[PDB]
Amino acid sequence: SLQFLLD
Amino acid sequence: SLQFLLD
Amino acid sequence: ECQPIFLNVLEAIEPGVVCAGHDNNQPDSFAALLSSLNELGERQLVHVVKWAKALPGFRNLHVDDQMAVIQYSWMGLMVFAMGWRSFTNVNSRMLYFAPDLVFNEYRMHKSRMYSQCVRMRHLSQEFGWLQITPQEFLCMKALLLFSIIPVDGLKNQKFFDELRMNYIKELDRIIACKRKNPTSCSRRFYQLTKLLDSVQPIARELHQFTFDLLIKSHMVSVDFPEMMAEIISVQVPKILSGKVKPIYFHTQ
Amino acid sequence: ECQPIFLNVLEAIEPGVVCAGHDNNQPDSFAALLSSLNELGERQLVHVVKWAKALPGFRNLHVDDQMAVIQYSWMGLMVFAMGWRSFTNVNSRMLYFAPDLVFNEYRMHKSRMYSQCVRMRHLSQEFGWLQITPQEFLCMKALLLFSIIPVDGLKNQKFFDELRMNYIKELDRIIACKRKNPTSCSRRFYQLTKLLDSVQPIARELHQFTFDLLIKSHMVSVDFPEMMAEIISVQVPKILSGKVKPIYFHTQ
Ligand SMILES: C[C@]12CCC(=O)C[C@@H]1CC[C@@H]1[C@@H]2CC[C@]2(C)[C@@H](O)CC[C@@H]12
Ligand SMILES: C[C@]12CCC(=O)C[C@@H]1CC[C@@H]1[C@@H]2CC[C@]2(C)[C@@H](O)CC[C@@H]12
Ligand SMILES: [Cl-]
Ligand SMILES: [Cl-]
Ligand SMILES: [Zn+2]
Ligand SMILES: [Zn+2]
Known part of the structure; x- marks a missing residue:
């Protein structure tokens, strides 16, 4: 997940 | 050998 | 006043070298070369996210726009970076994707994307032809983050606009540095942005x-x-339908 | 008339990237890190011979002098090259010996040559500090081939002298290109040759x-x-006894 990395 | 490579 | 203001940060946050993990003992098959390029992409994307987060101003965008700009610009960002690595490491003779994944003509033919590889090799050779400096390369690259957006705009459009301009202005400080003649900067900028548009x-x-x-x-x-x-299943169709388009520096 | 005359050849003959073949699964021991550096050296030396052969004018030297200059200059040549690779690929944060042999601080300590590594890292950071361009790098490097000789001279001393000057003059064309002010070239040359002397x-x-x-x-x-x-058992004692010395661009 993109979203977890951005976090 | 250096010499063989130079040749 | 044309001493750079983000350049030191750009140098400190430049990602390092990422391997594909490709097993070079294996045949140059379409399945093997593409599986490695996709693997190299996923790894590069972790680096691009961490770089983009650290880029001055990027974290001021709405969190959603952060996501949209990473999702639409990653391809151009990783293409431009590879070009530069190809130029510095092998003088553009081959596409230097990663140290364990270097494409010669035979790999370009087996990847079934030979004409696109030729186009990348050409972009790589421009770094040589235009004598792009390493400082110009890092500011040009940050511009590429800001070069593709929805036709309808992002949540905070005017903020994205402002950040884009600040990166255009930083590339301009890097140009104007070692140039004394008034007119020479815009002429160099023009050759650089033609390159970014290609x-x-x-x-x-x-x-x-x-x-x-x-x-x-x-x-x-x-x-x-x-x-x-x-990212490819959901986002790329938006680019193909023309919902999301590049911002060109010149008419095309 | 300050369009370069050997620069296109310098680009075409630049060697590609050489791996050490180091097994990164292994402990950072003194024995393992040095065995790989020596292996990387032997591999680089095959590249340096083939490059030096292709360098304009080098094959006019007496065959014996060809041998003496490769034997005395290889260390500086491979040090300078690594500096540049360290700068382009990881921004000088680490000594980029080869893609599979990258030295962080811990490897610099385990190699028992920590202060010499610090000195290389510094040389690497100068490429950034002095904004060395890729064209300047290739002409500076060819100069390093011609920068260490016996105190008594070589067989064809006056010929070596003439070739050295032609490489000083080529680095000068690369300097004078994108510079308009009469005095600026010698000031850039001075900063570049200070770098070569270090x-x-x-x-x-x-x-x-x-x-x-x-x-x-x-x-x-x-x-x-x-x-x-x-090369090390026979030749290096000649450099240590002062039978063979560097040609400095400035008093030291
Ligand atoms: C961005 C990458 C991977 C990283 C890179 O250096 C540039 C390169 C350009 C072509 C891309 C590739 C990732 C995987 C892709 C998208 C393949 O599915 C087809 C073309 C590939
Ligand atoms: C030239 C090399 C190997 C190639 C290189 O990138 C620079 C590097 C600098 C230190 C050298 C090493 C080759 C092996 C040596 C000579 C070791 O025995 C000690 C220091 C090493
Ligand atoms: Cl100018
Ligand atoms: Cl000037
Ligand atoms: Zn200007
Ligand atoms: Zn001049």
Whole structure:
């Protein structure tokens, strides 16, 4: 997940 | 050998 | 006053070298070369996220716009970076994707994307032809983050506009530094941004190609890692339908 | 008339990227890190011979002088090249010896040559600090081939002198290109050659070190490949006794 990395 | 490579 | 203001940060946050993990003992098959390129992409994307987070101003965008700009610009960003690595490490003779994944003509033919590779090699040779300096390269690259957006705009459009301009202005400080003649800066800027614009049609041909490959990838033994699969299945059709378009520096 | 005359050849003959073949699964031991550096050296030396052969004018020297200059200059040549690779690929944060042999601080400590590594890292950071361009890098490097000779001279001394000057003059064309003010070229040349001179004491500390290591290498499990062993056992004592000395661009 993109979203977890951005976090 | 250096010499063989130079040749 | 044309001493750079983000350049020191750009140097400190430049990612290091990422390997594909490609087993060079194996045949140059379409399945093996593409599986590695997709693997190299997923790894590069972790670096691009961490770099973009650290880039001055990027974290001021709405969190959603952060996501949209990473999702639409990653292809051009990684294409431009590879060009530069190809130029510095092998003088453009080959596409230097990663140290363990270097494409010679034979790999370019077996990847079934020979004309797109030729176009990347050409972009790589421009770094030599235009004598692009390493400082110009890092400011040009940050510009590429800000060079593709929805036609309808992002949540905080005016903020994205402001950040874009600040990166245009930083590339201008790097130009004006070692130049004394008033008119020479805009002439160098013009040659640099022509170069950035020629990244856009390459990134578009690679979007078409990877979208077309992802939906048939099971048929041809090509492995797409999950993050890449996700971004390409959902986002790339938006670029192909013209919902999301590049910002060109010059009419095309 | 300050369009470069050997620069296109310098680009076409630049060697590509050479791996050490180091097994990164293994402990950072002194024996493992040095065995790989010596292996990387032997491999680089094959590239340096083929490059030097292709360099304009080099094959006019007496065959014996060809041998003497390769044998005395290889250390500075490979040090300077690594600096540049360290700068382009990881921004000088680490010594980029080869893609599979990258030295972080911990490897610099385990190699027992920590202060010499610090000196290389510094040289690497100068490429950034002085904004060395890729064209300047290739002409500076060819100069390093011509920067260490016997005190008594070579067989064809006056010819070596003439070739040296032609490489000083080529680096001068690369400087004068994008510079309009009469005085600016000699000021850039001066900063560049100060940089080339600081390669010489680093190459001398590494000569002492590898000579001292080769004669005890059996005691410490360090493998020296045959070509390297040969050049270091016979030639390096000539540099240590002052029979062979660097040509400095400035008093020291
Ligand atoms: C961005 C990458 C991977 C990283 C890079 O150096 C540039 C390169 C350009 C072509 C891309 C590739 C990732 C995987 C893609 C998208 C394949 O599915 C087809 C073309 C590939
Ligand atoms: C030239 C090399 C190997 C190639 C390189 O990138 C620079 C590097 C600098 C230190 C040298 C090493 C070759 C092997 C040596 C000479 C060791 O025995 C000690 C220091 C090493
Ligand atoms: Cl000018
Ligand atoms: Cl000037
Ligand atoms: Zn200006
Ligand atoms: Zn001049």
